[PDB]
Design a protein around this ligand. Structure first.
Ligand SMILES: CC(C)CCC[C@@H](C)[C@H]1CC[C@H]2[C@@H]3CC=C4C[C@@H](O)CC[C@]4(C)[C@H]3CC[C@]12C
Ligand SMILES: [K+]
Lengths: 192, 412, 294, 117, 117
C-alpha cells in the first residue's frame, strides 16, 4: 500500500518552470531580433505616388539563373529605369519593384526573372514595359514611400509581411501560458 | 557631428572631481587654528542587506540594470546613424528614467557612505559615474549616442546574493555555481562591449577608414569562439586596437581560468552522489537496512532476501549509511540497477530519517559489524539507533543484530 | 506547398493533450458527492527487464530505432524537393512500419504506466510523441517531409543495458565506457540534426533567402570539428538561429565535459595494469613465485 | 613575476623570428612569396596561435614560416606541459586569509583567540 | 631491420613528394635495385620469422608481423611492372615502435623515465 507518496511530482512543476522560462527567453530574443525588419517596415509610409516617366536607358545587366541542378549560368537583360512623382511630396523619385530587386540592382526600376534565353528576357522586358506604359500620370494607386533613408526610392511591394512576424511571436506567448497553467495546476493537485 | 567627445568627457570629469576632493578633505589635523549623523543613519537604515527595505531596493537596482542592458541591446543593434525623432526607442523619457534612479541611488550611496574614499573606490561604485553622465549629455543633446552603457552589465555580480535572500536556492554549491555563472556572463558581456565599441569607429592611424561593420551579436559570438579556443577565424578583429585588446582578453580569460578552475570550479564539479527520498515506486512495501552497511553483510543478506524462491514478494530495500558506498558501488552495486537505492544520510539525524520516510516502512533492519574492536560499543551504538528509530516512529517493527547477550536486556 | 506546419503541429497537439489531461485527472478528492488491474498486469508482465519477453522487446525497440535512423540518413541526404512517386525510399509501407510498432509501444507504455504523469514526463517517453505523429501526417499527405525524426537517435542511451542482459560485455568499466560512448554519440547526432534542420530553411528575417545548402554529413562533421575545438571555419553556421544554437551547443558540450571527465571518464581512463594468464610461450616449463613479492 | 617575464621573453623572441623569416620570401621562389606584415601583426598571430584560438585571418605563408610555426607550437606545448603542473599550479593556489580586520569605522573590536571549531 | 625500415621511409618520402606521373626511366630514384634491396631482406626476414615462429598462428597475428605482408608484396609487383607505384609503404614507419628497446641494449640511455619517454 501507499500514502501521499503516490503524488511524487518532480516531472511536472519542473517542466512548467522550464516552459515559462523558454517562453519568456524566446520572445525576448525575437524582440531584439525583429526590431530591425519592423523598423524598416514602419519607416515606409503610404502615399499615392504616380508614374512620371519611363525611359529606356539601354544598359545591360547580368543575372544569375538556376535550373535546380546547381546551375551557375548567367544571362543578360536590358535595364529599365522609371521615375515616379510623389503625391504629397511632389518629388521626383526612382521606382523599384521590391527590396530584393533594389539591393541587387538600384539602377533598374525592375528586374524581370532571369531567363536562360536573352530573347525571352527581352520579350518579358517589352511585355512588362507595355504593362507599365499604359498607366502613366493619372490613376494614382496604393504606394509605399520612404522619406528618411531612401527619399529617392519608391517600392511597389512591401519589404516584409506581418503574418510571419506575428506567427513567430504568438508561439512563445502561448508557450509561457502553457508553462503557467502547468505550474498552478500542479499546485492545485499538491493540496489534496 | 563631432560632439561625441563631450559624453565620455562628462563621465571622466565627474570621476576627476571625485578622486581629488574626497582625499583632499582628509588632510591637516588642525582644521584652522592659525545633523550629519541623522542623515547618515537615515541613509544607512535602508542600505542594510538584512533589512526588508534594503533587500527589495537591491532587487530594484538589479532589475533596472537588466532593463538598461535590454535597451542597450536594442540601440547597439542599429546602424551608426538613423533619423531619431518620431520613434527613438521610446524617447528621452526611458533614456532618463533608469539613470534618474541610479543618480539618486549614487547620491544615496554617497550620503550613505561610511568611509568616504573607500565608498568611491569600491568597484561597485566606479561603474556608476561611468554609465550615468553620458546619458545626461545625450538628453541635453536630445540625440542618442552609443556609450559605455554595457558596463552596467557588471551589476550581474550581485545575482548570487539576491538568490540567497529571496531564498530560491539554498545549497552552498548551487550559490557558488550561480556566482561563477554570473561573473562569467558579466565579464563576457563587458569584454564583448569593449570590442564592439573599439570596432565601431576605425583605428585612429588610418583616419577611421578601416572600420568593421559588425553587430554587438557578431562581437559577443567572436569572444565566445575565442575564449573557448575554437577560433573559426570567420570573424576576427581587423583593427590594431582591436587586436591589442583581443590579446589582453585572451590573457585575462586564461588568467581567470587558471585562478578559478583548481579552486572553485573543481569543488563545484564534484558533488553529493546520493540524496533525496526512495520515491517513485507505486504499491510496494518498503524496509530500510539501517546500521552497518559493508560489502559482505549486504552480499549475504540480499542473496537470501531476493533469491527468487519467495515467489509472491516485492523488492523494497532502501538502504542507509553515513560513510557512503565508496567501494560497494564497484565491488557490487546493490545486486540490481533499476531497483534498490542508497541514502547517504545517517540513521540518527531526524531530517535524514524523514528522507527515507521511515514512517512508511514495514521494518528497519539493523546490521552490526561482528569484526568490531569493542563489542559493547557496537551494541550500544545499535541500541542508540533503535532508540532514535523508535523515537521518530513508535509504531514500527525493528530487527537488530546484537554482538553480546547481556546487551539484549537494554532493548527491554 | 506550405502544409509542413501541420506535421510539427500534430506532434505538439498530442503533447498538449498529454500534459493537460493526465494532471487534471488527479484533482478533487471527492469524485462527485454533491478490469484495470488485469490489463495493467498484462501490460507490465512483458515490460520487466529481467523477464525474457521484456529483454527481447527492448532489443526490438532499439533495432527499429536504428532502422528509423538509417532511413532518416537516406532521405535527409536528398535535395529539398524530388519527384516522390515511383521510388520514394521503399514507399509509405516502410514509412509507417516502424511507427506502427512505436505507436503500439507508446500505447503499451501508457497502459503499462504505473504512475500516470511520471510515465509521460520520463525523457524516454517525451521523444516518442515527437517522432511518431509527423510521419502519420506524411502518410496522410502521401508526401515525405524531413521532420524531427533524428531525435529517435536518443534511444541509443539504452545500448549499455542491452549489452548487459545479452551478456556480451561484463566488466563494469567496459559497461561505463559503452554507456559514455552511446550518450556522446546520441547527443552529437541530436545536435547535428538540430543544426541541419535549422539551416535547411533560411532565417525568418531575410524571408528564408540566407539558407545554406549543406548535407546532414557536412553538418555532423562541423559539430565534431567544433566540439573538439579544432574549428577549421571551412564550414560554419551562417544563420542567426544557427549561431544562437551553435553558442548553446558549445556551452552544453563544455558543461558535459566539465561534469563528466573528473567523475567518470577519469575513472575509466585508469584501469587494471595486470590480468589474464601467462600464456603464448610454447614448450617451456613453468613455475609461480607465490607469497611475499618484494 | 619570473614566469610572466620568461613568457614575455619567449613570445617576443618567437614573434621576432617569424617576423624576420617573413620579411624576405622563401629562397625557393626567389623571395617573391614575401608577406608584407608588421612585427605587431606577427606577435599578435603568435598569441592567437599559442592560446589555440587560431582565427586564420593571418598565418605564415612561407614554407620556412610554417616549419618554424610547427616548431613554436611544439615548444609552447612543451613549456605548458613542463610548467603548469610544477609551478603554475602552485602559484594558482595561494593563502585564503591575510592582512588586518581593517576598514570598519567607529566600532568596538574583540578577537576570539584559541580553539576555533 | 630498424635501419632498413628508416631507409625505406626516406625513399618513400622521396617518391611520395613527386607528381602523380613522371617519366620513370633514366633516373627512377636509383632504379629497381634499391626498390628490391630492402624488401629482399624483409622477405627473407619474414621467412626467417615464419620458420623461427614457435606458435604458428600467433606469430602471424602479432601486429609486428601483420605490417610485413602489407609493405613487401606491392613492391614485388612494382618490379614485375618495372614502374613505381605509391603504395602503403608508409606503414613501415610502424617499426619505430622498437626504438626504445634498441636504446636499451645499445646502452645509450639508462633511466626508466627516459626509456618511457
Ligand atoms: C518557446 C519556443 C521554443 C517555442 C517554439 C516556437 C516555434 C515552434 C515557432 C516560433 C516561430 C515560428 C515560425 C515563425 C514563422 C513562420 C512563417 C509562417 O508562414 C509559417 C511558420 C513559421 C516557419 C513558424 C514555424 C514555428 C516557429 C519556429
Ligand atoms: K581554430
Amino acid at each position: 500500500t501507499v500514502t501521499a507518496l503516490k503524488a511524487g511530482e518532480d516531472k511536472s512543476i519542473r517542466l512548467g518552470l522550464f516552459l515559462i522560462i523558454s517562453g519568456v527567453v524566446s520572445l525576448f530574443i525575437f524582440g531584439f531580433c525583429w526590431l530591425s525588419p519592423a523598423l524598416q517596415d514602419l519607416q515606409a509610409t503610404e502615399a499615392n505616388c504616380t508614374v512620371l516617366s519611363v525611359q529606356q536607358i539601354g544598359e545591360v545587366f547580368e543575372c544569375t539563373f538556376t535550373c535546380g541542378a546547381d546551375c551557375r549560368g548567367t544571362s543578360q537583360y536590358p535595364c529599365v529605369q522609371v521615375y515616379v512623382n510623389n503625391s504629397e511630396s511632389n518629388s521626383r523619385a526612382l521606382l523599384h519593384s521590391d527590396e530584393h530587386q533594389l539591393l541587387t540592382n538600384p539602377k533598374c526600376s525592375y528586374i524581370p526573372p532571369c531567363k536562360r534565353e536573352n530573347q525571352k528576357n527581352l520579350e518579358s522586358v517589352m511585355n512588362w514595359q507595355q504593362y507599365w506604359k499604359d498607366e502613366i500620370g493619372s490613376q494614382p494607386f496604393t504606394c509605399y514611400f520612404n522619406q528618411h533613408q531612401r527619399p529617392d526610392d519608391v517600392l511597389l511591394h512591401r519589404t516584409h509581411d506581418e503574418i510571419v512576424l506575428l506567427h513567430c511571436f504568438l508561439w512563445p506567448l502561448v508557450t509561457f501560458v502553457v508553462g503557467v497553467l502547468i505550474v498552478v495546476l500542479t499546485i492545485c493537485a499538491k493540496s489534496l | 557631428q563631432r560632439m561625441w567627445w563631450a559624453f565620455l568627457a562628462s563621465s571622466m570629469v565627474t570621476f576627476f572631481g571625485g578622486l581629488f576632493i574626497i582625499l583632499l578633505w582628509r588632510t591637516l589635523k588642525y582644521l584652522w587654528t592659525v545633523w550629519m549623523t541623522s542623515v547618515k543613519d537615515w541613509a544607512g537604515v535602508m542600505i542594510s542587506a538584512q533589512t526588508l527595505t534594503g533587500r527589495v531596493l537591491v532587487v530594484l537596482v538589479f532589475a533596472l540594470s537588466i532593463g538598461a542592458l535590454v535597451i542597450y541591446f536594442i540601440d547597439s543593434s542599429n546602424p551608426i546613424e538613423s533619423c531619431q525623432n518620431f520613434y527613438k526607442d521610446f524617447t528621452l523619457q526611458i533614456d532618463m528614467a533608469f539613470n534618474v534612479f541610479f543618480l539618486l541611488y549614487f547620491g544615496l550611496r554617497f550620503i550613505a557612505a561610511n568611509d568616504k574614499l573607500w565608498f568611491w573606490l569600491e568597484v561597485n561604485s566606479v561603474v556608476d559615474f561611468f554609465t550615468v553622465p553620458p546619458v545626461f549629455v545625450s538628453v541635453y543633446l536630445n540625440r542618442s549616442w552609443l556609450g559605455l552603457r554595457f558596463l552596467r552589465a557588471l551589476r550581474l555580480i550581485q545575482f548570487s546574493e539576491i538568490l540567497q535572500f529571496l531564498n530560491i536556492l539554498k545549497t552552498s554549491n548551487s550559490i557558488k555555481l550561480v556566482n561563477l555563472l554570473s561573473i562569467f556572463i558579466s565579464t563576457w558581456l563587458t569584454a564583448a562591449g569593449f570590442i564592439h565599441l573599439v570596432e565601431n569607429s576605425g583605428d585612429p592611424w588610418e583616419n577611421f577608414q578601416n572600420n568593421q561593420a559588425l553587430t554587438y551579436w557578431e562581437c559577443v559570438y567572436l569572444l565566445m569562439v575565442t575564449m573557448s579556443t575554437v577560433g573559426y577565424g570567420d570573424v576576427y578583429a581587423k583593427t590594431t586596437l582591436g587586436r591589442l585588446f583581443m590579446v589582453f582578453f585572451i590573457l585575462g580569460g586564461l588568467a581567470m581560468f587558471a585562478s578559478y578552475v583548481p579552486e572553485i570550479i573543481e569543488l563545484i564539479g564534484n558533488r553529493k552522489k546520493y540524496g533525496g527520498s526512495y520515491s517513485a515506486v507505486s504499491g510496494r512495501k518498503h524496509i530500510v537496512v539501517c546500521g552497518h552497511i559493508t560489502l559482505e553483510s549486504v552480499s549475504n543478506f540480499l542473496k537470501d532476501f531476493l533469491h527468487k524462491d519467495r515467489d509472491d514478494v516485492n523488492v523494497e530495500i532502501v538502504f542507509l549509511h553515513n560513510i557512503s558506498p565508496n567501494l560497494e558501488l564497484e565491488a557490487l552495486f546493490k545486486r540490481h540497477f533499476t531497483q534498490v537505492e542508497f541514502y547517504q544520510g545517517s540513521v540518527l539525524n531526524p531530517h535524514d530519517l524523514a528522507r527515507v520516510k521511515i514512517e512508511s516502512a514495514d521494518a528497519c533492519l539493523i546490521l552490526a559489524n561482528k569484526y568490531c574492536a569493542d563489542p559493547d560499543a557496537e551494541d550500544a551504538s545499535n541500541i542508540m539507533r533503535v532508540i532514535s528509530i523508535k523515537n521518530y516512529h513508535p509504531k514500527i517493527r525493528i530487527i537488530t543484530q546484537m554482538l553480546q547477550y547481556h546487551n539484549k536486556a537494554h532493548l527491554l
